[PDB]
Amino acid sequence: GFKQDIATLRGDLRTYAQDIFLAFLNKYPDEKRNFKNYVGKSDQELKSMAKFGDHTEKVFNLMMEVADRATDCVPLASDASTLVQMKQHSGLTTGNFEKLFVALVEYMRASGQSFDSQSWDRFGKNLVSALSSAGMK
Numbered sequence: 001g002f003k004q005d006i007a008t009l010r011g012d013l014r015t016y017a018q019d020i021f022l023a024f025l026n027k028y029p030d031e032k033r034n035f036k037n038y039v040g041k042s043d044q045e046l047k048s049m050a051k052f053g054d055h056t057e058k059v060f061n062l063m064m065e066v067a068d069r070a071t072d073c074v075p076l077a078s079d080a081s082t083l084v085q086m087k088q089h090s091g092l093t094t095g096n097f098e099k100l101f102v103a104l105v106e107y108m109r110a111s112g113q114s115f116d117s118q119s120w121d122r123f124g125k126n127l128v129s130a131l132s133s134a135g136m137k
């Protein structure tokens with residue numbers, strides 16, 4: 001289920017993190033404009049850029065902690081506030097996070113592994129709701 005999925009992803013996190021984030025950037029090409037130096041690069045070129053590997057790993061390291069601390073796929077309000085107050089996320093909206101979780105769920109459904117994709121769909125929706133209550137537009 002959800003808790004085991006966290007362990008599965010953490011077991012090979014750098015690979016899953018890059019694959020899922022690329023699936024997100026390729027399903028929603030306009031999201032690349034939020035990052036410097038991503039436009040005009042193929043997947044393999046992005047994976048060889050230092051800031052891509054660093055950001056993607058940090059995103060998933062923290063996302064797995066937020067998921068680990070959640071109850072019934074509902075994140076802690078404190079975790080949502082932390083994500084809102086990051087200066088890095090100034091200018092972002094709940095829509096950016098919504099699209100990331102759509103790509104993540106689609107990736108799980110196509111992987112063929114025993115992911116609990118329905119619980120991750122709920123988690124993404126519940127996280128977006130928490131971000132809104134925390135102050136994100």
Ligand code: HEM
Nearest residue numbers: 031034035036051055058059060062063088089096097100
């Ligand atoms: C669960 C969701 C997310 C988590 C946990 C997360 C986490 C993080 C963390 C920890 C950093 C700073 C890393 C460091 O200081 O080394 C960061 C930076 C950043 N994040 Fe997020 N992030 C999430 C979603 C997103 C989304 C959806 C976007 C854009 C669509 C985004 C865009 C950025 C940008 C632009 C930066 C700083 C500039 C850069 O690294 O290129 N993040 N994020």
